[PDB]
């Protein structure tokens, strides 16, 4: 309607399509159901939920006068969205750790076909996400805010009541420290170590081999650059929304809303906050070669 | 002199071919066209073994269909319980590259072999409780491909040196030898009567040897590639062979020729193991296509397909009582079908 909803809809559609094809490949193509791949598909699920929980959340924030799903509606929606975001971040950092352990320490490969271990790890990650989301779920609620420009009230979600603004702030900070600082730092260090190891391997592997080793060298350099750009995209996508939420929590302006140009900014952040969800599948699509083959096959 | 012997050999070959073609009045197919069809045999996996570590290469059933010895390429012989799926004994082999294993008819001893050229006969009923090397016989100039027990004192072993050998476990020496193959012997199946046994080698032919007499009674040259698997027919009068050509051939000892060739265009992968059922109608054969095929011994049509595994099926065997079929593949997992 405002020339921006179309871009958000297209992003959500492409992300849903990517994640759906990814899960369909993981299920149908059993050959790709190895030990680590579980984690990968887990992320997709999270992403799916996020996307499946992103359509309504925004659909009610824009092109609407006030909240629609009600009190329990906002409760469950915020709970599931925060759980999906936490699961996504945790699975991303776990995949980074696994790639680090496999590339930097290739001789320490764990036992294969141990699907039970990865399943228990994913279950623990999901449980930790749900536990860390329970606070906002129990404290979230729909409240009315006044608008002096309109001289009327409008209902909207709030992770905490206005009477405990400070509390909210603290939570927000914690969320940041738990969703941006430590995850970004660990992913960055792991990807840097992986890229350094890949470069040292490309330098160590025989380069004189006639058109047989240079191909692997180029592939290793390409995947190293991809891994290095992954963390950059993750940061550029999760910094805008984090700063937006920090501003909203530190301000917590009640009975008044600054309806300035800020609108575009926040929604822009949202788009970026979702771009990463679409980058994770395609990222993998860029890593391997036969992966693209069976992806286009199932697609 | 050499020319005379060459001419005599050629004349004998021609005479054998003529005598074999003369008796071919009718093929097994023409006579088996009037019998009712076997139909589709949809088998299902009842048990799944998850204990093996490396590629499961060899397995064999004992007198009882409960115990099942299975050999892995990590140097491990596991005695599974087909009923409860429990593990009975675990024998760490001194040689990791094991390619054969057998369960004695008395259920007390188990043998094996491989690239080490030494056959290790173990005892399971030791009073000490743990498994111990009862005997370690050597003498073969090649790798051991298949082993089978004739009794609690004698054991036949086929080696890659193109010759088989029947050993006395008590004496620990070659009770007798069997030479004549021009290629490495890959499989050996004992007849139900225990009097004779057929063996196939890399050469496009198989030979039927006698236990009491150290000589071959019949030789079959109806092959195109290396015969990898061989199984005696339950009646002991015929036997099925399977080579890399992906075509199972049923040779009858009484007719001394191929009766029915089980082949298909879409099947190109070689054969690794073959087995028969209690009745013999269902002829099972493992292929390199990550699955097994069960054909009709009479109709020759494909009766069923077992595609549960995800890697080359390296061994397969039906129980003596006819209740299930074990299949070990390189995926380190053994599946029991019924």
């Amino acid at each position: 309607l405002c020339a921006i909803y179309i871009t958000y809809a297209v992003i959500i559609s492409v992300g849903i399509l990517g994640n759906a094809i990814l899960i369909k490949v993981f299920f149908k193509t059993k050959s790709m159901q190895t030990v680590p791949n579980i984690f990968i598909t887990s992320l997709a699920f999270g992403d799916l939920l996020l996307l499946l929980t992103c359509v309504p959340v925004d659909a009610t924030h824009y092109l609407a006068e006030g909240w629609l799903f009600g009190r329990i509606g906002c409760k469950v929606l915020s709970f599931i969205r925060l759980t999906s975001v936490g699961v996504s971040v945790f699975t991303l950092t776990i995949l980074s750790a696994d790639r680090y352990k496999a590339v930097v320490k290739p001789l320490e490969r764990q036992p294969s076909n141990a699907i039970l271990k990865t399943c228990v790890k994913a279950g623990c990650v999901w449980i930790v996400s749900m536990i860390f989301a329970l606070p906002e779920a129990i404290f979230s609620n729909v409240y009315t805010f006044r608008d002096p420009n309109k001289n009327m009230t409008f209902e909207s979600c709030t992770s905490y009541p206005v009477s405990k603004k400070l509390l909210q702030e603290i939570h927000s900070l914690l969320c940041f420290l738990v969703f941006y600082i430590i995850p970004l730092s660990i992913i960055s260090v792991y990807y840097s170590l992986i890229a350094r190891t890949l470069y040292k391997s490309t330098l160590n592997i025989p380069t004189e081999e006639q058109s047989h080793a240079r191909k692997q060298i180029e592939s290793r350099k390409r995947i190293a650059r991809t891994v290095l750009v992954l963390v950059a995209l993750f940061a550029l996508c999760w910094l805008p929304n984090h700063l937006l939420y920090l501003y909203h929590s530190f301000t917590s302006q009640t009975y008044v809303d600054p309806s300035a140009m800020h609108f575009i900014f926040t929604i822009f952040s949202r788009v970026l906050a979702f771009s990463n969800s679409c980058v994770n599948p395609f990222a993998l699509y860029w890593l391997s070669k036969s992966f693209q083959k069976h992806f286009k096959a199932q697609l | 002199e050499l020319d005379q012997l060459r001419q005599e050999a050629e004349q004998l070959k021609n005479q054998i071919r003529d005598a074999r073609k003369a008796c071919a009045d009718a093929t097994l197919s023409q006579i088996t066209n009037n019998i009712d069809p076997v139909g589709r045999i949809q088998m299902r996996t009842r048990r799944t073994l998850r204990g093996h570590l490396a590629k499961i290469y060899a397995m064999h059933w004992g007198t009882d269909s409960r115990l099942l010895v299975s050999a892995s390429q990590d140097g491990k012989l596991i005695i599974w319980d087909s009923y409860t799926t429990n593990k009975v004994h675990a024998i760490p082999l001194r040689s990791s590259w094991v390619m054969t294993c057998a369960y004695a008819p008395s259920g007390n001893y188990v043998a094996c072999g491989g690239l080490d050229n030494i056959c290790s006969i173990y005892n399971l009923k030791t009073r000490e409780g743990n498994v111990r090397v009862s005997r370690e016989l050597a003498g073969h100039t090649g790798y051991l491909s298949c082993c089978r027990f004739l009794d609690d004192n004698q054991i036949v072993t086929s080696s890659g040196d193109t010759t088989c050998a029947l050993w006395d476990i008590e004496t620990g020496q070659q009770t007798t030898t069997f030479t004549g193959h021009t290629g490495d012997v890959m499989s050996l199946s004992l007849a139900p009567d225990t009097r004779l046994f057929v063996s196939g080698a890399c050469d496009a032919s198989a030979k039927l040897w006698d236990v009491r007499e150290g000589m071959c009674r019949q030789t079959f040259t109806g092959h195109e590639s290396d015969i990898n698997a061989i199984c005696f027919f339950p009646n002991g009068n015929a036997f099925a062979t399977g080579s890399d050509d992906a075509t199972c051939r049923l040779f009858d000892l009484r007719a001394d020729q191929e009766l029915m060739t089980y082949s298909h265009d879409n099947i190109i992968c070689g054969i690794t193991s073959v087995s028969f059922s209690k009745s013999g109608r269902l002829l099972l054969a493992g292929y390199d296509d990550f699955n097994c095929n069960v054909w009709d011994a009479l109709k020759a049509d494909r009766a069923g397909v077992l595609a549960g595994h995800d890697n080359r099926v390296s061994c397969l065997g039906v129980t003596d009582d006819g209740m299930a079929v074990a299949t070990g593949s390189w995926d380190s997992f053994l599946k029991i079908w019924n």
Partner: protein
Amino acid sequence: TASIAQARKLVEQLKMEANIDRIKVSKAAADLMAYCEAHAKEDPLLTPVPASEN
């Protein structure tokens, strides 16, 4: 020495293989079909059986 030895060995092998009693393929096929028809009543999978016995 060795060449003539193996030649004579192969000649004797082919001789003892040719002087073997043979029969028509029809009788062997009939005997095999009779064995199959007689043992079908105890075949593992040719005939269905209840899970109580399995």
